[PDB]
Amino acid sequence: KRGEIGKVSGIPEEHLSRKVIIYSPARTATQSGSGKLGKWKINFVSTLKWENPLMGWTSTGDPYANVGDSALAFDSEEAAKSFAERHGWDYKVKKPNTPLLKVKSYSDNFKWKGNPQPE
Amino acid sequence: IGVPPNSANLTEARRRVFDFFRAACRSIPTIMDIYNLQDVVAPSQLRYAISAQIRNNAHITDPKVIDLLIFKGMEELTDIVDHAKQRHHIIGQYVVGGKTDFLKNFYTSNYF
Amino acid sequence: RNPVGGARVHFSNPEDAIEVFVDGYAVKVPKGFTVLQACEVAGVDIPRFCYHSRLSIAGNCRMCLVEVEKSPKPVASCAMPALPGMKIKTDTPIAKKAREGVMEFLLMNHPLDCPICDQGGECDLQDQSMAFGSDRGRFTEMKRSVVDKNLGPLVKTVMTRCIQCTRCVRFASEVAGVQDLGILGRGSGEEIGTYVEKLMTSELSGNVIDICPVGALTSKPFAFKARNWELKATETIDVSDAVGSNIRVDSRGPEVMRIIPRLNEDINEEWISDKTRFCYDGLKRQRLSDPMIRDSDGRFKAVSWRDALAVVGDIIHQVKPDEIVGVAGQLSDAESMMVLKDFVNRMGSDNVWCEGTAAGVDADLRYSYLMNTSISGLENADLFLLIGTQPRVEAAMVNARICKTVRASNAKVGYVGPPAEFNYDCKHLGTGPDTLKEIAEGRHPFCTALKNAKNPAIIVGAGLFNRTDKNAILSSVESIAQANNVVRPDWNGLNFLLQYAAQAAALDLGLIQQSAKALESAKFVYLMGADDVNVDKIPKDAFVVYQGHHGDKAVYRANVILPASAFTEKEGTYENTEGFTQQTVPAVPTVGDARDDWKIVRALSEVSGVKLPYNSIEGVRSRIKSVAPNLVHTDEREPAAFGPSLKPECKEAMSTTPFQTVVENFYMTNSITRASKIMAQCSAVLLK
Amino acid sequence: GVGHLARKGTGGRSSVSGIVATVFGATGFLGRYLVQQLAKMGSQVLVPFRGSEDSPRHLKLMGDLGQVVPMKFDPRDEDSIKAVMAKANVVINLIGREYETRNFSFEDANHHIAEKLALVAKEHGGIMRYIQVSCLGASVSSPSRMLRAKAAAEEAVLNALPEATIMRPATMIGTEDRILNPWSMFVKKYGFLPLIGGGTTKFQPVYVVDVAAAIVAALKDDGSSMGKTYELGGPDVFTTHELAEIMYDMIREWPRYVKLPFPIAKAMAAPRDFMVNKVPFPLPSPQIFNLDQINALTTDTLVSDNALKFQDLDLVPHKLKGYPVEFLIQYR
Amino acid sequence: MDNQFIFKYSWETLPKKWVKKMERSEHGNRFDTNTDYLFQLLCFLKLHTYTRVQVLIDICGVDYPSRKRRFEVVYNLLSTRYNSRIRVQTSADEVTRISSVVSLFPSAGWWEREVWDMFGVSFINHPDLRRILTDYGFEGHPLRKDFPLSGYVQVRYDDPEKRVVSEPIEMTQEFRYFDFASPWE
Amino acid sequence: RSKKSPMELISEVPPIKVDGRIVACEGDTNPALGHPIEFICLDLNEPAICKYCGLRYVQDHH
Ligand SMILES: NC(=O)C1=CN([C@@H]2O[C@H](COP(=O)(O)OP(=O)(O)OC[C@H]3O[C@@H](n4cnc5c(N)ncnc54)[C@H](OP(=O)(O)O)[C@@H]3O)[C@@H](O)[C@H]2O)C=CC1
Numbered sequence A: 001k002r003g004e005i006g007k008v009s010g011i012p013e014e015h016l017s018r019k020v021i022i023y024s025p026a027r028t029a030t031q032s033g034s035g036k037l038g039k040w041k042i043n044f045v046s047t048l049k050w051e052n053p054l055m056g057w058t059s060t061g062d063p064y065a066n067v068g069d070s071a072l073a074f075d076s077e078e079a080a081k082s083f084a085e086r087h088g089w090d091y092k093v094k095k096p097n098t099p100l101l102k103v104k105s106y107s108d109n110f111k112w113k114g115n116p117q118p119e
Numbered sequence B: 001i002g003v004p005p006n007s008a009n010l011t012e013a014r015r016r017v018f019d020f021f022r023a024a025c026r027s028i029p030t031i032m033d034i035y036n037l038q039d040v041v042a043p044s045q046l047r048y049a050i051s052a053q054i055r056n057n058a059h060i061t062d063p064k065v066i067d068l069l070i071f072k073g074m075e076e077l078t079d080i081v082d083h084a085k086q087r088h089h090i091i092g093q094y095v096v097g098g099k100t101d102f103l104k105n106f107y108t109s110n111y112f
Numbered sequence C: 001r002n003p004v005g006g007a008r009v010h011f012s013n014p015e016d017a018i019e020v021f022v023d024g025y026a027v028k029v030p031k032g033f034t035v036l037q038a039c040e041v042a043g044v045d046i047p048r049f050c051y052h053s054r055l056s057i058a059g060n061c062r063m064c065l066v067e068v069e070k071s072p073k074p075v076a077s078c079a080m081p082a083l084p085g086m087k088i089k090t091d092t093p094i095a096k097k098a099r100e101g102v103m104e105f106l107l108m109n110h111p112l113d114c115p116i117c118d119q120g121g122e123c124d125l126q127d128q129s130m131a132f133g134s135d136r137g138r139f140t141e142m143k144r145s146v147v148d149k150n151l152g153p154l155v156k157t158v159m160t161r162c163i164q165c166t167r168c169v170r171f172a173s174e175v176a177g178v179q180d181l182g183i184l185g186r187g188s189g190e191e192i193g194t195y196v197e198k199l200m201t202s203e204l205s206g207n208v209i210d211i212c213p214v215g216a217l218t219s220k221p222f223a224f225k226a227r228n229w230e231l232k233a234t235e236t237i238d239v240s241d242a243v244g245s246n247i248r249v250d251s252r253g254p255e256v257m258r259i260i261p262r263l264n265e266d267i268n269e270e271w272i273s274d275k276t277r278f279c280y281d282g283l284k285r286q287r288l289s290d291p292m293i294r295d296s297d298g299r300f301k302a303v304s305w306r307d308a309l310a311v312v313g314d315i316i317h318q319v320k321p322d323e324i325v326g327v328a329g330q331l332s333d334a335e336s337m338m339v340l341k342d343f344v345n346r347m348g349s350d351n352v353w354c355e356g357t358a359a360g361v362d363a364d365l366r367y368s369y370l371m372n373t374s375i376s377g378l379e380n381a382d383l384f385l386l387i388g389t390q391p392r393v394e395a396a397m398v399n400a401r402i403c404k405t406v407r408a409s410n411a412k413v414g415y416v417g418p419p420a421e422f423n424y425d426c427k428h429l430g431t432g433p434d435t436l437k438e439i440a441e442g443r444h445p446f447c448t449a450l451k452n453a454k455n456p457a458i459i460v461g462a463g464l465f466n467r468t469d470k471n472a473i474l475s476s477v478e479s480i481a482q483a484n485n486v487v488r489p490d491w492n493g494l495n496f497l498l499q500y501a502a503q504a505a506a507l508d509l510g511l512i513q514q515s516a517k518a519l520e521s522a523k524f525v526y527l528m529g530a531d532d533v534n535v536d537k538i539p540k541d542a543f544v545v546y547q548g549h550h551g552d553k554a555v556y557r558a559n560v561i562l563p564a565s566a567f568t569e570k571e572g573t574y575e576n577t578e579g580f581t582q583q584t585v586p587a588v589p590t591v592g593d594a595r596d597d598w599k600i601v602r603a604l605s606e607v608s609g610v611k612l613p614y615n616s617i618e619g620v621r622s623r624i625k626s627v628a629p630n631l632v633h634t635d636e637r638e639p640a641a642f643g644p645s646l647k648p649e650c651k652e653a654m655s656t657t658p659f660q661t662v663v664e665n666f667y668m669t670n671s672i673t674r675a676s677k678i679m680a681q682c683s684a685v686l687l688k
Numbered sequence D: 001g002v003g004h005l006a007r008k009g010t011g012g013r014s015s016v017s018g019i020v021a022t023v024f025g026a027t028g029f030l031g032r033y034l035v036q037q038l039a040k041m042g043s044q045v046l047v048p049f050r051g052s053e054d055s056p057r058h059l060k061l062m063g064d065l066g067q068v069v070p071m072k073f074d075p076r077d078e079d080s081i082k083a084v085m086a087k088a089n090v091v092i093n094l095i096g097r098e099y100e101t102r103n104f105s106f107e108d109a110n111h112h113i114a115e116k117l118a119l120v121a122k123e124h125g126g127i128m129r130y131i132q133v134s135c136l137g138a139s140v141s142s143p144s145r146m147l148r149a150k151a152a153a154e155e156a157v158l159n160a161l162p163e164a165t166i167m168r169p170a171t172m173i174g175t176e177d178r179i180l181n182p183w184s185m186f187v188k189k190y191g192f193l194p195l196i197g198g199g200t201t202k203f204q205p206v207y208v209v210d211v212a213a214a215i216v217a218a219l220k221d222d223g224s225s226m227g228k229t230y231e232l233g234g235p236d237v238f239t240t241h242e243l244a245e246i247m248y249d250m251i252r253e254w255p256r257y258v259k260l261p262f263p264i265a266k267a268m269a270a271p272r273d274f275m276v277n278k279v280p281f282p283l284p285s286p287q288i289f290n291l292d293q294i295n296a297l298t299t300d301t302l303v304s305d306n307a308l309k310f311q312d313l314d315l316v317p318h319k320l321k322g323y324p325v326e327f328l329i330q331y332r
Numbered sequence E: 001m002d003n004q005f006i007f008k009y010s011w012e013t014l015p016k017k018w019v020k021k022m023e024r025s026e027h028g029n030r031f032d033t034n035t036d037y038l039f040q041l042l043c044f045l046k047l048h049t050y051t052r053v054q055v056l057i058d059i060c061g062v063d064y065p066s067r068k069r070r071f072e073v074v075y076n077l078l079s080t081r082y083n084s085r086i087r088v089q090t091s092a093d094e095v096t097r098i099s100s101v102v103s104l105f106p107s108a109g110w111w112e113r114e115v116w117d118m119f120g121v122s123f124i125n126h127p128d129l130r131r132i133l134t135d136y137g138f139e140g141h142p143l144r145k146d147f148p149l150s151g152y153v154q155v156r157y158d159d160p161e162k163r164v165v166s167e168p169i170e171m172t173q174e175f176r177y178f179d180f181a182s183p184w185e
Numbered sequence F: 001r002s003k004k005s006p007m008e009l010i011s012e013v014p015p016i017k018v019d020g021r022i023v024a025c026e027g028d029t030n031p032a033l034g035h036p037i038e039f040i041c042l043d044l045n046e047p048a049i050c051k052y053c054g055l056r057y058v059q060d061h062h
């Protein structure tokens, strides 16, 4: 990793040694549209959150709590890999699962069972 | 004055590093007076601090990255020369400073 | 251009490939694709309401109407087959005017209850109404209404929002296999229902919540809790069974809101079971969060991590090396099992095993405990022989694909085991070991079909491994496999189906029990999340340590409790029944002072004066690489190397005791579901 | 005694430590640092105060929102103390006075209040950790009346609660201390610094931040501190002369010492002693000529060679020559 | 005078090796040029009789993390004499120094300082290139897409230290990101 | 009567008698000041509840 851009960027050294996941989010199961597909994202695995003991709000101490979901998006895997390489982040890539178009026809709903077999 | 043109080789980058280091070293007397660092730090511990920063940033081989690092260091030096930053800030950045590491981190929290 | 959603078109041959013009663009599709599929290949995404790629075609909604040159009227692209030279048009005024007509008809009797609908920010009806619909409504008369009906404790039903796409009916008839739902009535008064008052008892019944494009069918436990835009989506996998379904955990802060499926053509194929979907409730109940040690009177006091580790490390040095027993759980990941095995081995013991199939099984060759036929490869089988297994309760998705193969390829299923309920037609060959002898010798009528099947598929269950005659049964099955060809270079048929998520990784790592009478002559037992073992076998003098995340019967007998993190809170590798390695992604923070299992075991090793070379999660995976190097090559489809010929001849005698059922309560299997509130009202009204 | 802390954050301002402390007398010198270090870990602090509502105003900044809750109370009344102590797993006592008010004598302000606070914690079972802060020279034979009262409060607290740790620091140095600041004020007002003993008595100044960190570490212990009496002292054994030399070094003025033997300073501090009674109950408090302090500065006060210290809590005191005394540049 | 005339004139008069992309639309006539020809183009467009562009409206940067040349620097120009607007764009990554135009337009100084502060793009021959908007000692360039919205450090008063201090950020309520994107877009 | 929660207050309003098989609930006398129109089917024995108001409607005769 040639994280020179990470050194000349301004990110603190503690946050430059994070482990990220480069992945392409898949289509939701509750909708049939395929518009929010093809974009690649960097997941910082920001899970350290707790509950405010005054109002129950969700508190955090991680700056990269919503960056990869809100602003940082890429059009291809190579772009995200290059970004992580230049920022010195240890990354692993999750290849997306894609559907396979099989042969389906309306006539298969109405198919002959076969001659009555007294087996 | 103006920002110098981007360097073309590593020798020019090294020359700029040395020039910046010399300028920072000449800036040491001014800081000891602008901020009450007389009875605080030796006039060489700070010099060692800049040397240590240059040395732990010494694995860069890209002239553009070296020039950007020099520019950022010069900006920091100019800010410190002015009264812009607070007194403890430089004393908080520019001062030189048993069972198992894993077991202490385990006793601390789950998030290493 | 690329197909919509990165869809992969499989051309069997280059010759059988017609050419169509979706929008003036040359598109090559195989003979058999429809106009909608051809448009999907050409990057054009057609509106749809009643069409689902996993359900039979039924052109009800009339929303995918397009224009074809040699057609006087618009054609339903979902059902119209693609013809060579056909010129499709999607963005013409005809197709538009059809789409705003159909949307206007669909939004005519629909109730004005978007704000209270749980499908609010994720509805296909309103999303397509905004895009392909009109702007102003011409309808002012009175709308129709229907009463709501109870379908159980899992599916909330508001049938006024039904658009009558019959996708739920088709799913129940084809995929679920339990025909209990249908379209009742005629005309605008037609309704979806069971007619009689009955509840959805299918293990795949929760999938009707996703196939429903509107808020007519919604989750009852996840009713009004949150909206979709409030939820962070994490792509994780299942640990409830050994199938390892790809799920998507949605959370709002430090708690998990819901679990929905995720596409994986090779494992789950867009479906998950009811135990997967509603197991998120137990992740927030009865969670161990603090280290605890019993007092003199017999009560657990909360103690710091340092003192609990000190106590266990002090007691571990007072027992003989062979007196130490370490038992892994069914939810354990591979790294924690490797750490536990190393720890116990360095202490001088060799008794490390898993909750379930750990009775002495030989994991020496890796084809004897894996689905040597891939799950997706079961679709090419012509005859399934289920020897002592009930996939409906053990591996619900394997049962789903078996039902798919039976209803599509007219395959035959022969079942040898205890009486049970099947969602497909099965012939009850027998109920015990004697049936296997009958099959092996021949003259049995099912043997004719077995030997006259091109691709037979024998599926042995993990429950056949706790028996005393295990070697004899595994030899009879192998004899059947050899005599009636099922294992060939072009097709492998012999399959073994595991029930626990950790069994495959445990067998790969060598976590196999050595002595049968090891938990009776023990003095220090480290239950690493293993609460599915009968603690009454443990002697009363043993020092039992329970390291897990949920409280169960093992807690009432443990001396030290070490809190742990759940599968939604850690990075772990799990292996499927088919040998496919996947990784979980953390979604929510760990609760209380709980740590990852491998961290707790390594810290215990350090306190017990045993050095472990590795100190990080990457160090563990390097150690695993020297034991099971296929557990670090995640997302790789590595087939088995050798076959059943290597096994030494074992002339034992098959017992006479009939096979048993391993899963009695399908909704009460692991500790997370055992602590859930949904799984109680599901095991109380849905199980008969 | 584990169960008084449960970390629920990153150890920052918005983090959550499972500590809910009631710090009596937190409006003084040490309280301003103890409450700040308690709030930094995410611990809720209840600050009971008396009199004006502006006294605890500066403590609200330390917590995030509701972490610091000032509550009025009256030491004479007992139900107020119980009300301000209900929601508390930890109680810290900092109540003490070095001069004498006609409303509260040396015994009342140092011993009886501590007794009442210990008793109320006794009936209100549930305080896991109780800390009472005496002074290093506390002994029954001490000529100073304040130190004897603090010692008696020590036995009272230990008897009423054997689990109560007694942190026993020495003379504190800080931005708002009552030893260095009065000296500089006198120097800027009269030109010379009087020495009530000729700059001979030896004592062990300690940084107030070090004492606050010691109390914090005693709270966040492994259980060893329970029922112990630490003696918090500085690294260097200074004297009244060498400390004044450092003060002149910081204040940048030419030294000028007026040596004064013990009898003359004792007789010069005497007038306030027998004039505590008058038409007004309040009377100008002593600054450098407290009779009690003069008596306390007759016997050398050093940390016991056979008693618990800073290094028994894994703490290193600051050297009171640089940062600890940097506040003296305001008179420069 | 107009987008139809300016485009055709600049097509002919301008040297071809300068501009490599010329969009002519109603949203704005743009010129995309290499960073080593920006000063030449802007000096030509400031002195030519028929393209008297004498006003530099502003200089902005746009962050595209998916591109190799990450940052896009846009020069919005105005011609008072002919009542027309021209936009000139270049592209630069994080370690390239583009030429400064303060020599031609004196108002370019503060906008170039703001671009350097917000994106980290350095300008050659700029009289003084220091941060203009962010706090003194600010680390990082906020207007980048990878910079967190709330930043990395937070400011509070430290009573023992008797000064305003900077501490790592810790939100009492984190920013809730709502994903309203539709799959039918 | 602050002791009564809104659930208990809406559980005390008697159901509205409707002659037909379906009723339209708007939530207020003035339609623009209520909730979106809700058509409720009165083809059961239990009173039918408006999902916005909480008001219950029951069939009058049959
Ligand atoms: N050099 C030092 O400062 C040393 C201090 N100590 C001990 O440390 C403890 C605190 O240190 P410090 O902060 O300097 O003490 P301070 O005198 O500076 O603060 C005194 C606190 O006690 C409260 N208090 C005093 N008398 C009464 C009373 N009669 N009833 C109720 N509350 C009262 C005050 O409240 P109000 O302000 O409203 O009266 C104030 O909050 C004291 O007990 C002191 O003896 C030990 C050794 C040396």
Ligand SMILES: CCCCCCCCCCCC(=O)SCCNC(=O)CCNC(=O)[C@H](O)C(C)(C)COP(=O)(O)O
Pocket: B013, B014, B017, B024, B027, B031, B050, B053, B054, B055, B057, B058, B059, B060, B061, B066, B069, B070, B072, B073, B074, B076, B077, B080, B094
């Ligand atoms: C109070 C003062 C304020 C400002 C203080 C300074 C703050 C910023 C500190 C500087 C930050 C930087 O990284 S700017 C300097 C960074 N640039 C480099 O390190 C160039 C790569 N190093 C090399 O080429 C060699 O190792 C070399 C070290 C040159 C010598 O070795 P040789 O010649 O044998 O080859």
Ligand code: SF4
Pocket: C110, C111, C112, C113, C114, C115, C117, C118, C119, C120, C121, C123, C124, C125, C126, C161, C213, C214, C215, C216
């Ligand atoms: S199903 Fe869709 S359109 Fe109908 S009310 Fe619910 S969100 Fe609105």
Ligand code: SF4
Pocket: C161, C162, C163, C164, C165, C166, C167, C168, C169, C192, C211, C212, C213, C214, C216, C217
């Ligand atoms: S209930 Fe849902 S899936 Fe079933 S027919 Fe109605 S809209 Fe379609």
Ligand code: FES
Pocket: C047, C048, C049, C050, C051, C058, C059, C060, C061, C062, C063, C064, C065, C076, C077, C078, C079
């Ligand atoms: S999707 Fe084709 S008619 Fe409904």
Ligand SMILES: [Zn+2]
Pocket: F025, F026, F027, F035, F038, F050, F051, F052, F053, F054, F055
């Ligand atoms: Zn209503």
